[PDB]
Ligand binder design. Structure first.
Ligand code: CDL
Ligand code: CDL
Ligand code: CDL
Ligand code: CDL
Ligand code: PLX
Ligand code: PEE
Ligand code: PEE
Ligand code: ZMP
Lengths: 128, 87, 69, 459, 54, 178, 52, 99, 174
């Protein structure tokens, strides 16, 4: 029939085409009810604080605080030297350095060879 | 820029569209008539009425809110509140 | 019908800009007037050969009157 | 130089003897007067330096740094009086005393004529900075930040002390003039390699060099506003000044020993710009921008051409002013909402118009926008690096693109969009804050008008 | 930010050195305060200084 | 926007949303009014053809196939109203929306420029402050012990009360503020 | 006002730890899923869907 | 609780007590005079006077001196047929090369 | 004008063709030039006359500094700090003068290209040769000294160049 749509990581699967959207178990309905209950509880708390007339300031967001903490200060305590981390770190932190070193050293060696052989167009190169 | 809307203007335009609907009898159409309890339409007809109102006033009614607009008075109130009409 | 336009308080920003303009122009305008008068009346020096046996000073080696001062 | 040194040592007793409510007024007024007096040092000669005495001398490289330090002191006073309202009188006076001591040490550091006196002063600058950070910082991490800053700097600088005393024993003098006139080539041997390494590594840690830079985010994020202003504006310039001074005696070994440092600086410039792209904290974003710009300055000093040195000096001055302004703006936002997260407060353009203008101007200068001195310095460094090699242009172009990206991203995130609904304590901007931003920004444009004053001796 | 700045540049220079110094400090200062033990140590030191230093 | 969402969309809600989306995309394809009316009548004819279906499994399969057909045949650039989320005029006036808490930080001279507005504003503030305790009491009386199971709020059950959590809904900025 | 128990912690290795983490992040225990323990520093932070 | 600790104080607003506050000090008179001295000294004195002083600093870098010297040397050398730029910085007669 | 030296800054004689109109139509350029002279040129000339009258009442003079020659780094002994200082300062002054010489030649080149316009490739060959020679000599003198250049380094470079030239001459004669 119609050509199928293949989702990617940068073009995800639409909800209307998700197979799980048309196969609803009774437990799925109670999961959705629990999710709505959690959202409603959080919404009620935020709205009460928001509409409080005596509140002056910023409603601190525990979720935002957890996010900013986990992004920076929680990374090193939870890092372990593994083969994957070691290889990725060595690659991403050493390979570019030596690649650029090889490129620049080769270029400058060729330039110096031309300078010594005296066949490089260096006229008008007054500023250096 | 454009002239401001009024409650009477919104009501007149919604009733104008509903009277230009064929499935609705113009004589028995009042601002309190229910689209299904006392007009005899169904869900698809209500969807078409909402789409006609969207085309009429040039703005979109979300599906979550449009399903509940079961009366011309409800449509008038919704559009007036969304467009910030108080007179 | 005119409707009230809700805006943040611009009084403090306007006051700061007014004070900044006043204090820049408090000394800037006299400086500009003085520079203009000096340039109009006490013009720049004219280059000349050093008379034999005369030893000038550094301000006599410089050209603009303000730089010489 | 005593006409500038003594008024600071008189700022000390005046601050300690003034009344409890006149401390800020007196300190600000007399700091501004001292800055005006120090403006007279910009009249330099084309042949040699200004040799005041056997102890202090001034050059085209020292003079703008001294003017920047003296102008930076009153701005730190204004920010401090913003955030230290509830402090006791004695602690306010101690804070002002630490700032005054830091300024005095910096002045004597830039004007010292011997390498050993320069070392003693530039190591003495650590104590007031460490006390300020670890005493008046806000958060818990100030202690760890102080430890990192202190031990990085000292581990860098101790081999420098050993190398300096060795060089004095070898040659007879550490006076800069004598070692410039009696300079001799450095043979390619392991001993010379390690002497080169000792000196350069001290100043590279002070710069900082990429891979030796973690203390910079740690210290700049966790220091009070005055500490952040002085750390980025002036204290990062001690490494550049030292490298521009000591490399007289390290030739021709610098031609061969500069490869690892050049590669580190270029790649780390790219890496820190990319890090800035994905930062959840505003102060961390500004700190990593500082790292990128100082990496560019390191590249300039290492390639070591007359066009690179002018670019290095211009970029140092421009970065000092711009980073100080950015830290002040971030601190005003923090004082509004008591948090450093970038996405917590938005719509600050529709809530605070003139601050939005200041943010726009500072962010425009943070990226190289012509004809600002930031662009002048960056362009000179890029041109010298192009004459050095023709792929440095690739690296510099990538860095410029990412710099524009993260600067405008910070501006768009903080200022544009819709305001956060629940943040209802954003009072209108103070005349003090607006005046602080004006005093940061106007001298930069005046320097753009007169650019030969900050291009160094090589001009 | 994560792999290099927060993890490996921290592990190489400041973290490894601090860990080594902490371990050496624990080793040095973990003594039971027994004169028998550290006087036997004195005897070993005397023998070594006599034999290995000429 | 003004209505609290539910936990899930029933089959009727799903099919009605699909019907509206298909009608909008068909209008995008059929630019002209007569052609659009013809093809919209045909589309409603298909919906009415499948309208009576006792088997919910078959109805769900028909819905799934219709959704796949829609996704294949959707307009790449459908018409969006200017003020709608995808529209060109969307969020244009968000920079002009200023809140009343920002209004109360005015200088006394600025406030004196509008003597009558701020008297009514003070009246509104008194009304808000005199009702918060009753609002919170009403909210906590009607909530289940477990907590709010939905995002809907109750009305004012008493003659002198206001619906709980009303201040920001009532005082939200106008759609064309400046 | 956030206590020391409301901050992200180590990778959960027991169902009690997983339940406590899910409660901490205001998530259902069935919906909670941490990043795989590869020593990348994620910790017990949930792996939410990669959408926008 | 584990301590007898003070509650975190509410943020203090300078605009509440003093509507026309410059944000320097709590005392209105001290705040006004702090603003006045900062603005006057900084903007007026430092900005204007230092900028004009720097603009009219004497030409101690010898830019115009060097230009006049170069003009004289160019005139003399092209009048006499000598090269405009000398080939050597020093005198090879005074330089003694190794054998 | 007597402001600058015509020999240092040459300008070819200006050949302006006489107008030869062929139509009876008025010339808008001529009318607008007359308007510009009447409205702008006369008032600015009067203002400059007044300013120059005010200047002539306060006529004072400034002089050009003359530096006598001093022994150079070749004459200075090894680690004789005073002679080294004098020679280094003299070398720096000579460096500045040479830079200004190159600047003058470059200004000649630019002005000649602009003046010649569309025939610049052929009519500016004379100024291109002078610039080539001056730039070649300046580059050989101060090409790769570095950021910390000094009279000693320039002398060492000259010694290296002289040794190379001597070796080349010997090889050619061999
Ligand atoms: C300035 C700007 C920035 C600059 C850059 C900065 C950042 C980059 C630089 C720093 C990079 C990281 C630091 C170097 C590596 C440190 C690793 C470490 O400390 O690990 C401790 C960490 C803790 O030890 P553990 O708790 O006993 O083991 C836990 C493991 O999860 C359980 O281990 P396992 O049993 O699963 O291990 C299996 C396998 C895991 O290894 C691998 O999968 C790696 C595969 C390639 C290894 C090398 C291949 C060639 C080997 C033969 C060469 C012959 C030459 C003649 O083991 C091997 O392959 C055997 C050992 C191989 C040599 C290791 C030498 C050390 O152990 C590991 O991470 C295990 C792997 C260690 C090696 C990984 C590869 C390293 C590559 C380095 C390249 C340079
Ligand atoms: C608040 C927000 C903003 C904040 C900003 C940040 C904060 C800033 C703080 C202040 C920073 C100051 C920085 C230092 C500045 C110091 C001054 C300085 O360096 O002056 C250098 C220099 C002054 O020359 P000098 O080196 O002192 O003397 C050399 C000569 O000896 C002189 O020649 P002379 O002696 O033969 O005669 C010239 C004389 C006499 O010339 C004339 O009289 C000219 C007459 C022209 C019309 C003649 C015909 C019409 C006559 C009508 C009547 C006819 C009948 C009557 C005739 C007379 C009676 C018979 O005029 C002058 O000398 C004028 C001097 C002006 C000095 C300005 C000083 C400013 C001080 C700093 C504070 C500023 C604060 C702001 C407020 C300023 C005041 C509003 O140039 C200027 O001041 C600028 C002149 C610009 C003229 C036009 C140039 C071309 C423009 C178009 C270019 C292309 C388009 C570009 C876009 C459009 C333009 C932007
Ligand atoms: C580890 C893999 C590795 O070698 O990475 C080098 C690489 C340097 O970049 P590159 O472009 O590969 O170097 C160019 C040539 O390979 C090497 O250049 P070259 O062969 O033309 O000759 C120059 C060479 C002359 O060779 C020597 O002097 C070798 C003799 C022993 C040197 C010991 C250096 C001690 C002082 C530094 C201590 C801290 C490191 O200079 C050096 O070795 C400079 C030593 C200092 C390097 C950078 C120090 C700061 C590191 C910051 C991140 C730390 C994490 O990365 C690092 O050094 C940092 C990451 C590893 C630590
Ligand atoms: C210098 C002025 C510095 C002003 C700082 C802020 C002052 C303030 O509070 O203003 C609010 C105040 C009243 O505003 P309000 O509505 O009451 O306040 C509510 C909002 O704040 C109202 O906010 P707003 O959005 O209306 O803000 C106005 C303005 C405020 O923002 C700015 O003024 C930004 C200016 C700094 C840009 C930084 C990056 C570039 C660095 C260039 C450095 C050049 C230095 C030259 C010497 C400067 C000496 C001070 O922002 C903009 O116009 C947007 C940025 C446009 C930048 C365009 C730059 C293009 C390159 C120009 C190169 C020119 C030099 C080379 C020429 C070569 C060929 C001849 O406005 C003014 O006082 C107007 C000041 C002038 C504004 C336009 C500046 C134009 C700059 C030159 C453009 C080229 C044409 C020549 C113009 C000659 C004059
Ligand atoms: C079109 C776009 C135009 C946009 C810009 C328009 C700005 C107005 C036009 C320019 C202003 C008129 C020209 C002014 C200019 O000529 O003066 C400049 C001079 O400006 C000042 O020198 C800038 C001073 C900068 C120093 C400020 C010190 C104040 C304290 C700051 C402390 C922090 C400094 C930290 C680093 C040192 C350049 O020097 P110069 O043209 O030849 O002076 C002429 C006088 N002569 C002939 C006798 C020499
Ligand atoms: C663990 C491995 C540590 C390696 C890094 C080195 C740091 C430990 C320092 C210990 C000294 C090791 C190098 C010794 C070099 C040395 O002594 O010789 C240099 C030379 C000796 O010459 P002579 O003895 O007179 O020989 C005469 C020949 N006829 O003396 C000098 O030039 C002065 C040099 C001072 C010593 C410098 C040692 C440090 C070198 C750079 C390391 C510092 C990096 C800073 C750290 C920051 C980043 C971590
Ligand atoms: C043979 C010669 C070599 C002998 C040793 C040479 C010393 C070289 C330089 C040593 C650096 C000295 C600082 C490290 C000392 C030990 C630090 C330490 O104890 O680590 C533990 C410590 C936590 O324990 P405490 O704070 O003591 O309190 C615990 C409460 N429950 O861990 C830390 O996080 C603190 C680390 C200090 C800051 C990090 C050090 C700064 C960077 C050091 C290297 C600098 C790189 C050079 C550039
Ligand atoms: P009212 O409350 O009466 O609503 C009646 C409903 C529909 C709720 C029924 O009670 C009902 O549920 N009936 C059983 C289920 C059912 O009718 N399903 C039908 C849904 S799909 C169907 O069969 C029709 C879909 C065909 C059209 C698909 C659109 C594909 C083309 C789109 C192209 C877009 C651009 C042209």
């Amino acid at each position: 029939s119609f050509p199928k749509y293949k989702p990617s990581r940068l073009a995800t699967l639409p909800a209307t085409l998700d197979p799980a959207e048309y196969d609803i178990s009774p437990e799925t309905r109670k999961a959705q009810a629990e999710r709505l209950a959690i959202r409603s509880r959080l919404k009620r708390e935020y709205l009460l604080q928001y509409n409080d007339p005596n509140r002056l300031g910023v409603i601190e967001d525990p979720a935002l605080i957890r996010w900013t903490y986990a992004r920076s200060a929680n990374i090193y305590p939870n890092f372990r030297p593994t083969p994957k981390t070691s290889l990725l770190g060595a690659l991403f932190g050493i390979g570019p350095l030596f690649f650029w070193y090889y490129v620049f050293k080769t270029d400058r060696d060729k330039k110096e060879k031309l300078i010594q052989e005296g066949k490089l167009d260096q006229t008008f190169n007054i500023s250096y | 820029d454009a002239p401001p809307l009024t409650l009477e203007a919104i009501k007149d335009r919604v009733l104008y569209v509903l009277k230009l609907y064929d499935k609705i009898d113009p004589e028995k159409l009042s601002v309190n008539s229910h689209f299904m309890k006392d007009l005899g339409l169904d869900s698809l007809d209500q969807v078409e009425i909402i789409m006609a109102m969207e085309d009429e006033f040039g703005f979109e009614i979300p599906d979550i809110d449009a399903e509940k607009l079961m009366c011309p008075q409800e449509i008038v109130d919704y559009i007036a509140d969304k467009k910030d009409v108080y007179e | 019908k005119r409707l009230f336009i809700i805006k943040p308080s611009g009084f403090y920003d306007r006051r700061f800009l007014k004070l900044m303009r006043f204090y820049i122009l408090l000394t800037g305008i006299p400086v500009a007037i003085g520079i203009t008068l000096v340039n109009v009346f006490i013009g720049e020096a004219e280059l000349a050969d050093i008379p034999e046996g005369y030893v000038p000073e550094h301000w006599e080696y410089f050209k603009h009157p303000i730089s010489r001062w | 130089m005593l006409k500038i040194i003594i008024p600071t040592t008189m700022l000390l007793p005046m601050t300690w003897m003034s009344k409890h409510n006149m401390i800020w007024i007196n300190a600000t007024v007399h700091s501004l007067l001292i800055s005006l007096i120090s403006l007279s040092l910009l009249n330099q000669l084309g042949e040699n330096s200004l040799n005041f005495s056997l102890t202090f001398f001034s050059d085209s490289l020292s003079a703008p740094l001294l003017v920047l330090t003296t102008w930076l002191l009153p701005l730190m006073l204004m920010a401090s009086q913003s955030h230290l309202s509830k402090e006791t009188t004695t602690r306010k006076k101690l804070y002002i005393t630490m700032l005054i001591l830091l300024q005095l040490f910096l002045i004597m550091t830039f004007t010292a004529t011997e390498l050993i006196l320069f070392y003693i002063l530039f190591e003495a600058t650590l104590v007031p900075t460490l006390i300020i950070i670890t005493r008046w910082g806000n958060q818990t991490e100030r202690l760890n930040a102080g430890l990192y800053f202190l031990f990085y700097t000292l581990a860098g600088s101790l081999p420098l002390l050993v190398a300096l005393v060795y060089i004095q024993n070898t040659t007879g003098s550490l006076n800069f003039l004598i070692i410039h006139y009696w300079s001799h080539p450095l043979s390619n041997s392991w001993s010379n390699i390690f002497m080169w390494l000792a000196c350069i590594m001290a100043f590279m840690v002070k710069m900082p060099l990429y891979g030796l830079h973690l203390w910079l985010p740690k210290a700049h994020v966790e220091a009070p506003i005055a500490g952040s202003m002085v750390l980025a504006a002036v204290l990062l310039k001690l490494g550049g000044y030292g490298m521009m001074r000591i490399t007289t005696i390290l030739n021709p070994l610098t031609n061969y020993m500069a490869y690892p440092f050049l590669m580190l600086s270029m790649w780390g410039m790219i890496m820190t710009s990319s890090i800035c792209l994905r930062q959840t904290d505003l102060k961390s974003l500004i700190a990593y921008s500082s790292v990128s710009h100082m990496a560019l300055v390191i590249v300039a000093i290492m390639i070591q051409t007359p066009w690179s040195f002018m670019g290095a000096t211009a970029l140092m001055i421009a970065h000092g002013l711009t980073s100080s302004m950015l830290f002040c703006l971030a601190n005003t936002n923090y004082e509004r909402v008591h948090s450093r997260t970038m996405i917590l407060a938005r719509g600050l353009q529709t809530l605070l118009p003139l601050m939005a203008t200041w943010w726009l101007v500072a962010s425009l200068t943070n990226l190289a926008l012509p004809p600002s001195i930031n662009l002048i310095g960056e362009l000179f460094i890029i041109t010298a690096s192009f004459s050095w090699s023709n792929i440095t242009i690739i690296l510099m172009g990538m860095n410029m693109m990412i710099t524009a990206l993260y600067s405008l991203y910070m501006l768009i995130t903080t200022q544009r969009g819709k305001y956060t609904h629940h943040i209802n304590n954003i009072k209108p901007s103070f005349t003090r804050e607006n005046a602080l931003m004006a005093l940061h920004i106007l001298p930069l444009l005046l320097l753009t008008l007169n650019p030969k004053m900050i291009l160094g001796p090589l001009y | 930010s994560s792999l290099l700045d927060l993890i490996w540049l921290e592990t190489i220079l400041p973290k490894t050195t601090s860990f080594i110094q902490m371990k050496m400090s624990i080793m040095v200062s973990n003594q039971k305060g027994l004169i028998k033990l550290y006087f036997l140590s004195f005897l070993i030191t005397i023998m070594i200084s006599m034999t290995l230093f000429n | 926007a003004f209505s609290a969402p539910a936990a899930y969309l029933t089959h009727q809600q799903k099919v009605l949303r699909l019907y509206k989306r298909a009608l909008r995309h068909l209008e995008s394809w059929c630019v002209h009014r007569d052609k659009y009316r013809y093809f919209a009548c045909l589309m409603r004819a298909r919906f009415d053809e499948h309208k009576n279906e006792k088997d919910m499994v078959k109805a769900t399969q028909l819905l799934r196939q219709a959704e796949e057909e829609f996704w294949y045949g959707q307009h790449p650039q459908p018409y969006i109203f200017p003020e709608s989320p995808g529209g060109t005029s969307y969020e244009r006036y968000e920079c002009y929306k200023v809140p009343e808490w920002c209004l109360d930080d005015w200088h006394p001279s600025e406030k004196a420029m509008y003597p009558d507005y701020f008297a009514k504003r003070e009246q509104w503030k008194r009304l808000r402050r005199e009702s918060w305790e009753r609002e919170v009491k009403q909210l906590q009386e009607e909530t289940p012990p477990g907590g709010p199971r939905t995002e809907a709020l109750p009305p004012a059950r008493k003659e002198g009360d206001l619906p709980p959590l009303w201040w920001h809904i009532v005082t939200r900025p106008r759609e064309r503020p400046m | 006002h956030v206590t020391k128990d409301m901050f992200p912690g180590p990778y959960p290795k027991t169902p009690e730890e997983r339940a406590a983490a899910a409660k901490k992040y205001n998530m259902r225990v069935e919906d909670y899923e941490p990043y795989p323990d590869d020593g990348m520093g994620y910790g017990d932070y949930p792996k939410l869907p990669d959408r926008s | 609780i584990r301590l007898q600790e003070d509650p975190d104080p509410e943020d203090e607003n300078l605009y509440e007590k003093n509507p026309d506050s410059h944000g320097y000090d709590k005392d209105p008179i001290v705040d006004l005079w702090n603003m006045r001295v900062v603005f006057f000294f900084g903007f007026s004195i430092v900005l204007v006077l230092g900028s004009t002083f720097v603009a009219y600093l004497p030409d101690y870098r010898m830019q115009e001196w060097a230009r006049r010297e170069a003009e004289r040397l160019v005139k003399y050398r092209e009048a006499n047929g000598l090269p405009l730029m000398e080939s050597n910085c020093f005198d090879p007669n005074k330089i003694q090369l190794p054998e | 004008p007597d402001s600058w030296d015509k020999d240092v800054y040459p300008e070819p004689p200006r050949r302006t063709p006489a107008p030869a109109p062929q139509t009876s139509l008025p010339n808008p350029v001529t009318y607008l030039t007359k308007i510009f002279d009447l409205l702008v040129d006369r008032p600015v000339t009067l203002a400059r006359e007044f300013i120059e009258q005010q200047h002539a009442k306060n006529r004072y003079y400034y002089y050009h500094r003359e530096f006598r020659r001093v022994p150079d780094i070749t004459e200075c002994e090894e680690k004789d700090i005073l002679c080294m200082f004098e020679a280094e300062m003299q070398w720096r002054r000579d460096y500045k003068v040479d830079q200004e010489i190159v600047n003058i030649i470059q200004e000649r080149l630019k002005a000649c290209q602009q003046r010649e316009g569309e025939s610049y490739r052929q009519n500016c060959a004379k100024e291109l040769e002078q610039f080539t020679q001056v730039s070649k000599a300046f580059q050989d003198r101060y090409s790769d000294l570095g950021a910390h250049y000094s009279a000693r380094k320039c002398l060492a470079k000259q010694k290296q160049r002289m040794l190379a030239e001597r070796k080349a001459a010997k090889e050619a004669a061999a």
